[PDB]
C-alpha cells in the first residue's frame, strides 16, 4: 500500500554510485525486489545516485518528451544510470540481466501530491 512513488523508486532508483560491474546490480536488484516472476523485465534503467535529488529532478525542469505525454521532467545534471537489459541468454526462470553504465539526465514522471516521481520516461 505504497504511494506508487516508493515502489517505482525501488524498481528504478536502485541507488548508490558505483562506476563498475554491470550484471551484478542488474540481477541483484531484480532478485532482491523479486521482479523475476512469471516473465522478467526485458529492459529497465537503474539509477545509482542521491534519491533526494530524484525528488528534486521531479520538481526541476519539465521537458516535452517524444510525445508530449504525462509531464516528464529532465534531471538538472547527468546522473549515473545502469541501463539494465536481458541478454539473448535470459531464459526464465534462468533470467540473465546485463547493465550499461551511462551518465545521462534521467527523465522522470512526477505527480501524486505531494509531488513525487512515480514513473520514468527515458535518460538523456
Curated annotation (Swiss-Prot):
Disulfide bond sites: 26-84, 40-95, 58-110, 65-72
S-adenosyl-L-methionine as UniProt keyword: no
Regulation: Allosteric regulation by both substrate and reaction products.
Gene Ontology BP annotations: defense response to Gram-positive bacterium
Enzyme Commission number: 4.6.1.18
Source organism, top-level taxon: Eukaryota
Residues recorded with modification Deamidated asparagine: 67
Tissue expression: Seminal plasma. Can reach 3% of the protein content of this fluid.
Keywords: Allosteric enzyme, Disulfide bond, Endonuclease, Hydrolase, Lyase, Nuclease, Secreted, Signal
Residues where substrate binds: 7, 10, 41-45, 66, 85
Molecular function via GO: identical protein binding; lyase activity; nucleic acid binding; ribonuclease A activity; RNA nuclease activity
Cell compartment(s), UniProt: Secreted
GO CC annotation: extracellular region
Catalytic reaction(s) noted: an [RNA] containing cytidine + H2O = an [RNA]-3'-cytidine-3'-phosphate + a 5'-hydroxy-ribonucleotide-3'-[RNA]; an [RNA] containing uridine + H2O = an [RNA]-3'-uridine-3'-phosphate + a 5'-hydroxy-ribonucleotide-3'-[RNA]
Subunit structure: Homodimer; disulfide-linked.
Protein's UniProt name: Seminal ribonuclease
Organism (species): Bos taurus
Span within the parent record: 27 to 150 of 150
